[PDB]
Coordinates of C-alpha atoms and ligand atoms in Angstrom, one line a residue:
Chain A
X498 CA 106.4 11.6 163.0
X499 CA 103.1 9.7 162.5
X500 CA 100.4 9.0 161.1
X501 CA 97.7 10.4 158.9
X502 CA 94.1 9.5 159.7
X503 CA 91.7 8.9 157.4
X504 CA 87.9 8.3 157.5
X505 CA 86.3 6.0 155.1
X506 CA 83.3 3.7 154.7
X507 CA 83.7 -0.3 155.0
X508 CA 82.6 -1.1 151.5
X509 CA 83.6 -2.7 148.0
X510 CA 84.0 0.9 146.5
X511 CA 86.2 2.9 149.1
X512 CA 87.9 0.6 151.7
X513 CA 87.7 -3.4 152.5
X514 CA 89.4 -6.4 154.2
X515 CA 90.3 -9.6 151.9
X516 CA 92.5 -12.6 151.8
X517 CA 96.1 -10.7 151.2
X518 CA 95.1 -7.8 153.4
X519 CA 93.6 -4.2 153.0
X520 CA 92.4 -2.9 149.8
X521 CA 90.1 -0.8 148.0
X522 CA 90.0 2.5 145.5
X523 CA 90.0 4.9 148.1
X524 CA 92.5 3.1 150.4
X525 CA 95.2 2.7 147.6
X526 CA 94.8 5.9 146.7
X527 CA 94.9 7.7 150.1
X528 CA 97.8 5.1 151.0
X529 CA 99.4 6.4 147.7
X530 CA 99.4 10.0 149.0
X531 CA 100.2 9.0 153.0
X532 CA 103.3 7.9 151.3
X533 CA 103.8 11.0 150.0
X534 CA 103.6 12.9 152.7
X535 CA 106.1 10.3 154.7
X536 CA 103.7 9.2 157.1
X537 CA 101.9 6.0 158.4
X538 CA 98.2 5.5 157.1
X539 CA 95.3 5.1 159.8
X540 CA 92.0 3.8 158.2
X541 CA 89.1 4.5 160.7
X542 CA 85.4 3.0 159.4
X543 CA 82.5 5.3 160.2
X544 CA 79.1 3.4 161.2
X545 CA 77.5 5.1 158.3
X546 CA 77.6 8.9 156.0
X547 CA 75.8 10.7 159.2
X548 CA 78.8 9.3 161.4
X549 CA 81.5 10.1 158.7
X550 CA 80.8 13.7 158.4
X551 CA 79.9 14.4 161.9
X552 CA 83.3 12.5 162.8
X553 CA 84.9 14.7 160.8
X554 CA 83.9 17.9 161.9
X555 CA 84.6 16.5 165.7
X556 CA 87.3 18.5 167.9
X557 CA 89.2 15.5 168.2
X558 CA 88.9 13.6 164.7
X559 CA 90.7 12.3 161.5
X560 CA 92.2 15.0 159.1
X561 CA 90.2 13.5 156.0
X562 CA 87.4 11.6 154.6
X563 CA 87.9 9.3 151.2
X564 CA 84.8 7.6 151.1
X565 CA 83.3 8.3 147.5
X566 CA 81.4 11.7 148.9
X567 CA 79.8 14.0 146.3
X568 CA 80.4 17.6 147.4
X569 CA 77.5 19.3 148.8
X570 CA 78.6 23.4 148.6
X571 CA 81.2 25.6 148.3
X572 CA 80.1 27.2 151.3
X573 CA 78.9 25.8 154.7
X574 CA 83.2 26.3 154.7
X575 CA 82.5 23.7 157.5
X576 CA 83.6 20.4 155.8
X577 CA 85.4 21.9 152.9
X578 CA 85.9 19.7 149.4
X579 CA 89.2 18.4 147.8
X580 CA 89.4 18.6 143.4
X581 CA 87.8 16.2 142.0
X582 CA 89.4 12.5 140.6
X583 CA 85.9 10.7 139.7
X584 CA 83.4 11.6 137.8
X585 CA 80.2 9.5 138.0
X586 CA 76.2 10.1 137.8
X587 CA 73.6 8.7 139.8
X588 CA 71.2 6.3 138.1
X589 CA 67.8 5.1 139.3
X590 CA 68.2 1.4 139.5
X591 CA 65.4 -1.2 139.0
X592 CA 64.5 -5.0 138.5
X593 CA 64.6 -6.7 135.1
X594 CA 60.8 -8.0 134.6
X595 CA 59.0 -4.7 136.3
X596 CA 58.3 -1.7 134.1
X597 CA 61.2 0.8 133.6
X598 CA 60.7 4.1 135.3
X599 CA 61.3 6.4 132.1
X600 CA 61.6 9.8 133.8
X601 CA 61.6 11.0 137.7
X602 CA 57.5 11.8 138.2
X603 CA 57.5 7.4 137.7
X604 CA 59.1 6.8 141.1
X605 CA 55.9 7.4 142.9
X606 CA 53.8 4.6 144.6
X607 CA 57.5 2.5 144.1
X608 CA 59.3 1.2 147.6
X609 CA 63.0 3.1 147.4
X610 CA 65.8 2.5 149.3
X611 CA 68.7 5.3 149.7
X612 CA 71.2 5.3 152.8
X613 CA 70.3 7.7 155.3
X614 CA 72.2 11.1 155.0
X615 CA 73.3 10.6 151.3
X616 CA 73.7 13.0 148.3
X617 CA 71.4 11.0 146.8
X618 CA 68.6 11.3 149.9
X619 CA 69.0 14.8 149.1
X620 CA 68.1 14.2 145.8
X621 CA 65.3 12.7 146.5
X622 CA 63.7 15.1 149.4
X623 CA 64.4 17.5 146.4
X624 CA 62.1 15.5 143.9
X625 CA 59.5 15.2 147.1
X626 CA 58.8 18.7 146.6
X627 CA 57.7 18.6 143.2
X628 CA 56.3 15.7 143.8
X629 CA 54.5 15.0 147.3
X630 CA 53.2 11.8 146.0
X631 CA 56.7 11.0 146.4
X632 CA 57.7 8.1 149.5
X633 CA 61.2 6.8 149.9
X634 CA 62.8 5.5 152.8
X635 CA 66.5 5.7 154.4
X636 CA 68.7 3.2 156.8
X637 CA 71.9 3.3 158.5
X638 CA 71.8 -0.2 158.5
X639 CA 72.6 -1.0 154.5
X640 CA 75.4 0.5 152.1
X641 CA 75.2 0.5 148.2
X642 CA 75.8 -3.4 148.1
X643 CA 72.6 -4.2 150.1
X644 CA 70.6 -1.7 148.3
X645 CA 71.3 -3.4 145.0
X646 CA 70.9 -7.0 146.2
X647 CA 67.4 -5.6 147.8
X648 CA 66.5 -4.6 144.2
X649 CA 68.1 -7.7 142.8
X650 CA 66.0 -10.3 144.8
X651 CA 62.9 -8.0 144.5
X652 CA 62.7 -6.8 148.2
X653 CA 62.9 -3.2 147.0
X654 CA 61.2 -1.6 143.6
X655 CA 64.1 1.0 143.0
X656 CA 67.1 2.7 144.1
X657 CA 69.2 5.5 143.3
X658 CA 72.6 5.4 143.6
X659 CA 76.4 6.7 141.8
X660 CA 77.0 4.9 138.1
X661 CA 80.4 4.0 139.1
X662 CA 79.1 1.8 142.3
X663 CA 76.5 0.1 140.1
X664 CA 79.4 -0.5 137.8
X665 CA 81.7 -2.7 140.5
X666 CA 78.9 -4.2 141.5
X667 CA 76.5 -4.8 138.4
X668 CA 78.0 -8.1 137.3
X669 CA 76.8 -9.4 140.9
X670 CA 73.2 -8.8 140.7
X671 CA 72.3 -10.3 137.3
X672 CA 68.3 -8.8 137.7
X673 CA 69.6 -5.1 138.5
X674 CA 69.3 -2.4 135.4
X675 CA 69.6 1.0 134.9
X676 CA 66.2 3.3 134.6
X677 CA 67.8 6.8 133.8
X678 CA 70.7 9.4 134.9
X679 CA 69.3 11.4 137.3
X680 CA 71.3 14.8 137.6
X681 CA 74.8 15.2 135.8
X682 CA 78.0 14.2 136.2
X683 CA 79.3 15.0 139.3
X684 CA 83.5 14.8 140.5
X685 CA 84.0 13.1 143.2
X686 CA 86.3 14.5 146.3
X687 CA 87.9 14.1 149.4
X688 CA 86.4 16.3 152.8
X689 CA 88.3 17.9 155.1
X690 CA 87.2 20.2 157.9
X691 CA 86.7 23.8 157.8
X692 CA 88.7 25.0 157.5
X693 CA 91.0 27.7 158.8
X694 CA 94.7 26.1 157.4
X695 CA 95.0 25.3 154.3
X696 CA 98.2 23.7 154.6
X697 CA 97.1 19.9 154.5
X698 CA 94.3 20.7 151.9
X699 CA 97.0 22.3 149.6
X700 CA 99.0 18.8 149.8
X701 CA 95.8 17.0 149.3
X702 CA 94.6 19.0 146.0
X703 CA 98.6 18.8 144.7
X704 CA 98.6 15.0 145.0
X705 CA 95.2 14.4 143.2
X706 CA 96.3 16.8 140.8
X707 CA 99.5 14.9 139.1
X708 CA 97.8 11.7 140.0
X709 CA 95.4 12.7 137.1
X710 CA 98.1 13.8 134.9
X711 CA 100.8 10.9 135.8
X712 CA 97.5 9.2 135.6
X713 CA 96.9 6.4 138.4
X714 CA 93.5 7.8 138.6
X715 CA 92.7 6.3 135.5
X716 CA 94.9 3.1 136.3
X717 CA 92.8 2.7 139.6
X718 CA 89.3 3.2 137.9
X719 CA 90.3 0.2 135.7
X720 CA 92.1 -2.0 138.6
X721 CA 89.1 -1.9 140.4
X722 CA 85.8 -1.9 138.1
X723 CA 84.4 -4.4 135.9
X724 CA 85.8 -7.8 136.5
X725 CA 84.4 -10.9 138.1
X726 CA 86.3 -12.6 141.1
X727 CA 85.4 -16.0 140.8
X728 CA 84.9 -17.4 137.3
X729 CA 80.9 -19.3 136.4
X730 CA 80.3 -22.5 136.5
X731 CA 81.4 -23.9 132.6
X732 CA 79.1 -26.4 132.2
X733 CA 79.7 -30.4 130.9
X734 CA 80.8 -29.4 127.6
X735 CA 83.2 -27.1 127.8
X736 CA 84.4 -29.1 131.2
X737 CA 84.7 -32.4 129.2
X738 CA 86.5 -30.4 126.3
X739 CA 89.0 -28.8 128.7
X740 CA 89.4 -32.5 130.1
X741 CA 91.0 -33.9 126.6
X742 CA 92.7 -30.8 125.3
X743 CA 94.0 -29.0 128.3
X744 CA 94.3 -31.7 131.3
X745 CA 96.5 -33.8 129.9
X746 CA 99.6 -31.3 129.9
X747 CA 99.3 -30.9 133.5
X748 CA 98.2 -34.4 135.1
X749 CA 101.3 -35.6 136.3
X750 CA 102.4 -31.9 137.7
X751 CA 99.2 -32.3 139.4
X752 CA 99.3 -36.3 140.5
X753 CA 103.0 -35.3 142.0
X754 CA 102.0 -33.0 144.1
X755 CA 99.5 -35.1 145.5
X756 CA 102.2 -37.6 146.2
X757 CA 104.4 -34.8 148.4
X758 CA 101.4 -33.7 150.1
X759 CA 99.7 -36.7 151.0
X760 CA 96.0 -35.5 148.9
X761 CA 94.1 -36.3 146.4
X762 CA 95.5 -34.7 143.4
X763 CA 92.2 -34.8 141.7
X764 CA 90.9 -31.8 144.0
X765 CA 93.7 -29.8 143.5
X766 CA 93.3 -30.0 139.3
X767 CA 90.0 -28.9 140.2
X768 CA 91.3 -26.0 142.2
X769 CA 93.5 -25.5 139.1
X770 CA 90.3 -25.4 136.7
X771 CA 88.2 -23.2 139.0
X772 CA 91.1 -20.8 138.8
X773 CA 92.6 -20.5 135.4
X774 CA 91.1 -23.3 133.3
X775 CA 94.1 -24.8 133.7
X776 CA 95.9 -21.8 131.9
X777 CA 99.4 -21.2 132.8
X778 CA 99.7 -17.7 131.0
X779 CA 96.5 -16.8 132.6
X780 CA 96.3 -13.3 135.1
X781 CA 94.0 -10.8 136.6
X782 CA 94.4 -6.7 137.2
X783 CA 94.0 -8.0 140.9
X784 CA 97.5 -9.3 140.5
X785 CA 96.8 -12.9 140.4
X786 CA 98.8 -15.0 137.8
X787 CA 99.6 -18.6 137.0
X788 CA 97.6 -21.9 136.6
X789 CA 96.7 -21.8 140.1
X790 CA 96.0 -17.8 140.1
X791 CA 98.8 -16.6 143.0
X792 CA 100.1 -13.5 144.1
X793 CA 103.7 -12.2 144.4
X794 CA 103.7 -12.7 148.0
X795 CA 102.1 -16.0 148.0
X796 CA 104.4 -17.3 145.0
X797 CA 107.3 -16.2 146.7
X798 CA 105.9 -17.8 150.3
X799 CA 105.8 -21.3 148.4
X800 CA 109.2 -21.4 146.5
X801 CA 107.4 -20.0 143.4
X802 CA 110.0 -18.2 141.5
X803 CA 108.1 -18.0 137.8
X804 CA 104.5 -17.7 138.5
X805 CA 104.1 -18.8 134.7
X806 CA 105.5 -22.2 135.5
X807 CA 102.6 -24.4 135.5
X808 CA 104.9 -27.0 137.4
X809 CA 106.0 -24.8 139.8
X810 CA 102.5 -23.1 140.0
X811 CA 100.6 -26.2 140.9
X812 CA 103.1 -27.0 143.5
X813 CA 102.9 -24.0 145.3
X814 CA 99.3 -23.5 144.9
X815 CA 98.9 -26.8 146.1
X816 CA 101.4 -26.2 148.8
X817 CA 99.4 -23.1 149.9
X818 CA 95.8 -25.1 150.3
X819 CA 97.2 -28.1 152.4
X820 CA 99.1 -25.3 154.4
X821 CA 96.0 -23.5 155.4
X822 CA 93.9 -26.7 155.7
X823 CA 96.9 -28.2 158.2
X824 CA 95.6 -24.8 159.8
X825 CA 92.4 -24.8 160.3
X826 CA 90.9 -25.2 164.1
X827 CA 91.3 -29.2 164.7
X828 CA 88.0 -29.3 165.6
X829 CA 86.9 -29.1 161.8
X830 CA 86.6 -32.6 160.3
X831 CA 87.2 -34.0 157.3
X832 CA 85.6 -33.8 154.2
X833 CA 84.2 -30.7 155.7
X834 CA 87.6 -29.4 156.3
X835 CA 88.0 -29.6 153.3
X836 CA 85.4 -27.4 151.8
X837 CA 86.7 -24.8 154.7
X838 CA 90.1 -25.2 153.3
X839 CA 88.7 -24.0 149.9
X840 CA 86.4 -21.4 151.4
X841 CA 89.6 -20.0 152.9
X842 CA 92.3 -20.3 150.1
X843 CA 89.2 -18.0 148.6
X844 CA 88.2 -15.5 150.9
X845 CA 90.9 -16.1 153.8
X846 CA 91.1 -17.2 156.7
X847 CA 90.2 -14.3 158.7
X848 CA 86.8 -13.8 157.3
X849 CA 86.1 -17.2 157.5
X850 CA 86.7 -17.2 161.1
X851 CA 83.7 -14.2 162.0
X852 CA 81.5 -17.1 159.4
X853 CA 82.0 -19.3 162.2
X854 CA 82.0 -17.2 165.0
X855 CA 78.3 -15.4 163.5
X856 CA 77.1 -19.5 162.5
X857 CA 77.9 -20.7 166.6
X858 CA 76.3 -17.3 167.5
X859 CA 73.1 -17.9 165.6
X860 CA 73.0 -21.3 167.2
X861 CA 74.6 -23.0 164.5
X862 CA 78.0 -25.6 163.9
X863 CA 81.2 -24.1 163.2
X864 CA 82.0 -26.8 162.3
X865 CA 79.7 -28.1 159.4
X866 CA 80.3 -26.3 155.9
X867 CA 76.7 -26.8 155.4
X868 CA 76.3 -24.6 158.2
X869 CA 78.9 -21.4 157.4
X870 CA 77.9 -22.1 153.9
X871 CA 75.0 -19.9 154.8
X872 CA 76.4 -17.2 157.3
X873 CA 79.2 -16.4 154.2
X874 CA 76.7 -14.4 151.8
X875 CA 76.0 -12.3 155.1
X876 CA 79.4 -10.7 155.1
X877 CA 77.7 -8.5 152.2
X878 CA 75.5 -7.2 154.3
X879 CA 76.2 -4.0 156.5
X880 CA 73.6 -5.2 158.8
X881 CA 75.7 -8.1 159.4
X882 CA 79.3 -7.3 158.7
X883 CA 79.7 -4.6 161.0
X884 CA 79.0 -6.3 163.9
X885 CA 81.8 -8.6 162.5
X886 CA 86.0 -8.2 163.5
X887 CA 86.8 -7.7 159.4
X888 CA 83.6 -6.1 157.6
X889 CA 82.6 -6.6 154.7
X890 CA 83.6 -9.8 151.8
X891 CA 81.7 -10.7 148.5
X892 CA 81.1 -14.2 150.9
X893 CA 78.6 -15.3 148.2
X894 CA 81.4 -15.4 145.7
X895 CA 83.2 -18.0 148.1
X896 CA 80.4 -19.6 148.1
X897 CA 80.2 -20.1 144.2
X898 CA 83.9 -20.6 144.6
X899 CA 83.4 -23.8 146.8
X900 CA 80.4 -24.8 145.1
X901 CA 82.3 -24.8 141.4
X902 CA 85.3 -26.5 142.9
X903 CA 83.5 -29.3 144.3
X904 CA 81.5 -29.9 141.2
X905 CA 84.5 -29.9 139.1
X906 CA 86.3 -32.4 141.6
X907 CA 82.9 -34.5 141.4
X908 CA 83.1 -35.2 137.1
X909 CA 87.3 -35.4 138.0
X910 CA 86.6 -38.4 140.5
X911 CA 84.3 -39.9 138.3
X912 CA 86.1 -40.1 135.5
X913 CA 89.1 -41.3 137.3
X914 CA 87.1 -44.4 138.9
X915 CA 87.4 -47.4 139.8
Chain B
X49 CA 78.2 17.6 155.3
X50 CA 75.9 14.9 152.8
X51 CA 77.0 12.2 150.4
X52 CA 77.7 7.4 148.9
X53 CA 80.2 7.0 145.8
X54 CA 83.8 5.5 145.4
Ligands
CL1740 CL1 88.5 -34.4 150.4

């Protein structure tokens, strides 16, 4: 048979694109529990919450929605609620150097964001009646991730949204902080329709149970929340340190490579130190391992049969960046292709394509990093991304990627002159 | 259905 559909939003939290392929907490999981059931997984994205539910409750629609929802009612019995396998709280959210909202009554005479036909606009219209004082707005046109950067860069005074999506996403907005809880904790669950078999609903609730006591739940909310995908910038110091303690074990692994590939070895040790600080034991919960941070199914594409080799790890790491430069649309030049090269090896290929498809469309050079430089933090915004092929990216973080390489291959060269 | 978690 097929072939279980499943509704969801494009976002960090619940279900994305990156560079080996889908991924996400609430796709793993739901692809953990199509695999139960024996049956292929079909990820539809709704074009935001009012979409996903009415989807949903559609003659013709998907069976479920994973999507982070908070249930709304035992009743309605229209969209009826999985258990539980999350429990977070929502936290106002504000900017570090304006005053700290202590307790609700303070979020009046503030501009706040919420997406349009959330729990937590609910919340809100609540507040409004104590309150009348009260003004908030809500879009269609934003998820969580542009809510937080609107805080972050000050276009927005607050925003209220679930502890657990400020906690993926915290570390990328250095000004964001936490006001107050606001409510208690509430489970997370999966909606179905209402409602009159219980059949599939009966598999769902058996799955999630089991997954909480063989506890996956609890491996997922740690493979997915708190970590930082590409490393800060290190500074001189540190750099210049790493450069007489650390450099020196891997220079010729590095300078042969070079030789095979025809490149200049210097930028792939700096490839090396963006990735692991030139640390062959190093790894990541994102499955990433080795001095030049691979995957299994990358390692194994490039002859890489111990990912802890730093000799076999720079050589297929290596291999893997002149592979998808070689493949990059000929009409990209060098150095820029280049920077592309590393903008890909980072975020892949196929985002990096829609960069240069939205840069020609906005009159731009697909063909300039300078130029895609800027449509990459863009892919992080809903706005944006949806009108994209493959949705949403961290872009921004390929852009620090690039930006860190490229400084580390600029002290590399000039210490390795004339 | 209303409510943006994950
Ligand atoms: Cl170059």
């Amino acid at each position: 048979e097929g072939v279980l559909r499943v509704i969801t939003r494009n976002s960090p939290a619940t279900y994305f694109q990156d560079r080996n392929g889908e991924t996400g907490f609430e796709y793993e999981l739901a692809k953990r529990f199509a695999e139960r059931l024996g049956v292929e997984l079909k990820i539809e994205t709704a074009d935001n919450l009012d979409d996903l539910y009415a989807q949903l409750s559609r003659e013709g629609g998907p069976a479920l929605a994973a999507a982070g929802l908070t249930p709304g009612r035992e009743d309605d019995a229209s969209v009826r609620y999985s258990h539980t396998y999350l429990d977070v709280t929502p936290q106002i959210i504000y900017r570090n150097g304006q005053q700290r909202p202590t307790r609700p009554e303070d979020l009046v005479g503030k501009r706040i964001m919420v997406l349009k036909g959330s729990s937590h606009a609910e919340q809100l219209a609540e507040l409004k009646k104590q309150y009348p004082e009260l003004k908030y707005e809500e879009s269609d046109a934003v998820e969580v991730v542009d809510l937080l950067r609107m805080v972050d860069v000050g276009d927005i005074d607050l925003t209220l949204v679930d502890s657990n999506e400020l906690a993926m996403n915290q570390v990328y907005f250095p000004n964001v902080r936490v006001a107050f809880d606001f409510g208690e904790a509430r489970g997370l669950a999966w909606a179905l329709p209402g409602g009159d078999d219980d059949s599939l609903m009966n598999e769902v609730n058996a799955f999630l149970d089991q997954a909480k006591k063989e506890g996956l739940l609890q491996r997922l909310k740690d493979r997915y929340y708190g970590h930082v995908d590409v490393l800060g910038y290190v500074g001189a110091y540190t750099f210049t340190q790493h450069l007489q303690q650390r450099l020196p074990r891997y220079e010729s692994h590095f300078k042969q490579s070079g030789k095979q590939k025809d490149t200049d070895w210097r930028l792939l040790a700096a490839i090396g130190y963006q990735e692991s600080l030139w640390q062959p034991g190093a790894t990541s919960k994102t499955g990433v391992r080795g001095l030049m941070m691979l995957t299994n199914r990358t390692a194994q594409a490039m002859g890489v049969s111990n990912r802890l080799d730093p000799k076999q790890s720079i050589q297929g790491g290596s291999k893997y960046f002149v592979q998808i430069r070689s493949e990059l649309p000929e009409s990209i030049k060098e150095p820029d292709r280049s920077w592309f090269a590393l903008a890909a090896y980072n975020i892949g290929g196929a985002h990096l394509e829609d960069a240069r498809k939205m840069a020609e469309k906005e009159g731009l050079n697909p063909n300039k990093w300078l130029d895609v430089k800027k449509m990459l933090p863009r892919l992080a915004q809903k706005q944006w991304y949806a009108k994209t092929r493959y949705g949403y990216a961290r872009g921004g973080e390929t852009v620090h990627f690039v930006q860190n390489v490229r400084r580390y291959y600029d002290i590399l060269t000039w210490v390795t002159q004339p | 259905x209303a409510x943006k978690x994950x």
